Amino acid sequence: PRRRVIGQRKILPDPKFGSELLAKFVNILMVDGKKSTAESIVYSALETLAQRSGKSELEAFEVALENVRPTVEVKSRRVGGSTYQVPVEVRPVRRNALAMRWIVEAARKRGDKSMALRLANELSDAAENKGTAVKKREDVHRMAEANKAFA
Amino acid sequence: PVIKVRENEPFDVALRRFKRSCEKAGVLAEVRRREFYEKPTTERKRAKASAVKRHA
Amino acid sequence: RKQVSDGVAHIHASFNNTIVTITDRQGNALGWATAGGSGFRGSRKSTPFAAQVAAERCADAVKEYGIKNLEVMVKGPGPGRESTIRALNAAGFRITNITDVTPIPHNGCRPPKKRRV
RNA sequence: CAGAAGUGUGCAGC
RNA sequence: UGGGGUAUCGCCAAGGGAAGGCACCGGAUUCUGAUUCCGGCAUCCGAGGUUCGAAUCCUCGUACCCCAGCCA
RNA sequence: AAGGCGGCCCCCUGGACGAAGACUGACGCUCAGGUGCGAAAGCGUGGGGAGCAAACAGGAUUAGAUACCCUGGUAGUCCACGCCGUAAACGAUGUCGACUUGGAGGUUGUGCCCUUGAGGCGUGGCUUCCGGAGCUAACGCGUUAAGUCGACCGCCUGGGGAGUACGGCCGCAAGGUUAAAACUCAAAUGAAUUGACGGGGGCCCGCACAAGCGGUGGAGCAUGUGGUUUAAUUCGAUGCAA
Ligand SMILES: *C(=O)[C@@H](N)CCC(N)=O
Numbered sequence: 148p149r150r151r152v153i154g155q156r157k158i159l160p161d162p163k164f165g166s167e168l169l170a171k172f173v174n175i176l177m178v179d180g181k182k183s184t185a186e187s188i189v190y191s192a193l194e195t196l197a198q199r200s201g202k203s204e205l206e207a208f209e210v211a212l213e214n215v216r217p218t219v220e221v222k223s224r225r226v227g228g229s230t231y232q233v234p235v236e237v238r239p240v241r242r243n244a245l246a247m248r249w250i251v252e253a254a255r256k257r258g259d260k261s262m263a264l265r266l267a268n269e270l271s272d273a274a275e276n277k278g279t280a281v282k283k284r285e286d287v288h289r290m291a292e293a294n295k296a297f298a
Numbered sequence: 299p300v301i302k303v304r305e306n307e308p309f310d311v312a313l314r315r316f317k318r319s320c321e322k323a324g325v326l327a328e329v330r331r332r333e334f335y336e337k338p339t340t341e342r343k344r345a346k347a348s349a350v351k352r353h354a
Numbered sequence: 355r356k357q358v359s360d361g362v363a364h365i366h367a368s369f370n371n372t373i374v375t376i377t378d379r380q381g382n383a384l385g386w387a388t389a390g391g392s393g394f395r396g397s398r399k400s401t402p403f404a405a406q407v408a409a410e411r412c413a414d415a416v417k418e419y420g421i422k423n424l425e426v427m428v429k430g431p432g433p434g435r436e437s438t439i440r441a442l443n444a445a446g447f448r449i450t451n452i453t454d455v456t457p458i459p460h461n462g463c464r465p466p467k468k469r470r471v
Numbered sequence: 472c473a474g475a476a477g478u479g480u481g482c483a484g485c
Numbered sequence: 486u487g488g489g490g491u492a493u494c495g496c497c498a499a500g501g502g503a504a505g506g507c508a509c510c511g512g513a514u515u516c517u518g519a520u521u522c523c524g525g526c527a528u529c530c531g532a533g534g535u536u537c538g539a540a541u542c543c544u545c546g547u548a549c550c551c552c553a554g555c556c557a
Numbered sequence: 558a559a560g561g562c563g564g565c566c567c568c569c570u571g572g573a574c575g576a577a578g579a580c581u582g583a584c585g586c587u588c589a590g591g592u593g594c595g596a597a598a599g600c601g602u603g604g605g606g607a608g609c610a611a612a613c614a615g616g617a618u619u620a621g622a623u624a625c626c627c628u629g630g631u632a633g634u635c636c637a638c639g640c641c642g643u644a645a646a647c648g649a650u651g652u653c654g655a656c657u658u659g660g661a662g663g664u665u666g667u668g669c670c671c672u673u674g675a676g677g678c679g680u681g682g683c684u685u686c687c688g689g690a691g692c693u694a695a696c697g698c699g700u701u702a703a704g705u706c707g708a709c710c711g712c713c714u715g716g717g718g719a720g721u722a723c724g725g726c727c728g729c730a731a732g733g734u735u736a737a738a739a740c741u742c743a744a745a746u747g748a749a750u751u752g753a754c755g756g757g758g759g760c761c762c763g764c765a766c767a768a769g770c771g772g773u774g775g776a777g778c779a780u781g782u783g784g785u786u787u788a789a790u791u792c793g794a795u796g797c798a799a
Pocket residue numbers: 556557
């Protein structure tokens with residue numbers, strides 16, 4: 148919008164672990180409004196990640212997300228006759244949104260036998276600093292530093 | 299434009315002095331003026347128009 | 355090889371490239387680097403960042419002689435006319451003097467015709 | 472930085 | 486006859502433990518574009534000798550240019 | 558005088574203006590024909606040639622690109638002595654003289670006043686910008702008139718054809734100058750007004766873009782249309798807005 152600026156809509160924290168961040172993650176994994184399906188998938192993935200890691204569920208999720216949150220992104224900036232890619236310091240809320248989106252979209256396209264297990268594997272790899280979500284973060288950073296000349 | 303950095307002068311203060319000195323000397327403007335030829339008719343036209351706009 | 359206490363950094367900064375040359379007080383070149391040679395081509399070749407990188411690579415090139423104090427002579431209008439000096443300072447040389455040596459004709463020769471882009 | 476062309480011919484509002 | 490080159494990614498080009506560009510492909514960018522940036526499978530003219538291993542050293546086989554030879 | 562004239566120094570040389578007188582005594586103004594000067598490009602002969610750059614070559618761009626952009630590059634640009642004689646050679650405004658409310662500045666003389674200054678008041682030359690009466694189709698001009706008058710000269714008579722043809726003069730040439738007719742149309746034109754438009758400027762909106770999510774274009778089928786077919790495949794809707 149060009150007139151307005153919008154105040155954020157009220158979210159409700161996750162009922163089992165009390166996290167609004169996990170609530171956002173559920174809301175991103177949700178499809179067609181089937182909230183409870185996404186909740187079941189997320190809870191199964193988190194408990195299996197917990198028993199793999201020897202960590203609490205939110206602790207394992209947080210340490211995974213740490214490994215994939217980007218620090219910079221590339222933005223198209225116009226000039227009177229040209230357009231340049233320029234690196235921009237992405238703000239933390241968008242960092243979390245990006246990391247969750249990348250985790251979810253990476254897991255979705257895995258081959259493993261169920262979405263809960265796909266998700267658990269992708270979170271393990273992310274916590275292990277490996278795999279598709281991490282390579283996504285990585286190449287974003289590569290592009291940013293390759294464009295650093297215009298910053 | 300020449301700058302001698304004094305003892306205990308901060309380097310960025312020396313940069314500030316250098317920038318202001320070379321700006322005040324007009325060196326960059328004189329370089330930009332000379333990169334292309336300008337017909338004398340064009341020089342006089344621009345002078346005249348600048349003078350014409352210098353009125354309240 | 356032979357030690358040198360101090361030297362002059364010559365910065366040649368055109369709109370298309372920046373060359374940084376270190377030389378002894380007598381004008382014998384000790385080392386050089388350029389923005390275009392640091393891996394920047396086209397639009398990036400003439401940015402202050404590319405000139406900073408060129409100055410850094412030039413400072414890394416003269417490490418043999420152990421120069422500690424230098425004088426900076428700046429030539430030309432291009433971008434990176436200043437960022438090179440900051441980079442040279444950060445490399446740890448004592449910037450003793452700064453000077454602009456850009457050639458100014460007292461009228462002199464006729465320059466090229468104006469571009470009708 | 473690139474971006475060309477648009478067939479002929481008409482009528483009310485006093 | 487002798488000497489020296491050349492035959493390595495689809496094309497152009499580096500290497501006693503297969504790189505770069507140009508293509509092609511995916512992604513980012515653009516009003517379309519053109520232009521830019523990140524990622525990608527990648528491949529030593531040939532037989533043998535050496536050796537843990539030679540695009541690579543050592544003989545030979547092959548093919549084509551330069552210079553110099555050649556009185557059935 | 559116009560074209561024009563820009564580092565510093567010397568030599569030769571033209572004009573302008575101010576103060577105070579003295580002198581001559583209408584000796585003045587304009588000017589057909591004529592004569593001289595006249596940017597740049599161009600021409601002749603002999604030099605010089607750094608930079609720039611018609612022509613030309615290559616690279617790009619593009620549908621093409623005999624261009625714009627890039628890398629080179631010859632005449633030319635410079636000098637001496639001749640020729641050419643044209644320019645938006647413009648203030649698009651002929652020369653000369655008189656008269657008619659003002660204001661702010663620039664530049665260059667000169668007089669008076671305690672000169673006290675970085676000061677006050679007067680009087681000439683040239684020049685920039687506003688604006689009054691008046692004038693003008695309007696825009697605008699406005700004591701430097703496009704105002705009110707006088708003298709003389711040049712020029713115009715609808716748009717094309719045409720500043721062309723032919724003839725004359727001039728020129729090494731390029732060409733310059735003087736200058737028609739047949740024919741053809743009912744307009745061509747100036748200033749300003751209201752819109753619209755601009756790859757002009759400023760400001761501001763809309764799921765317009767951006768940020769996201771889910772789709773269409775691929776498959777089968779339903780349904781509408783185009784085309785074809787038929788005896789008939791009834792008619793209408795046909796960018797957005799069928
Ligand atoms: C062959 O060459 C024989 N007829 C002569 C020999 C020679 N001249 O070498």
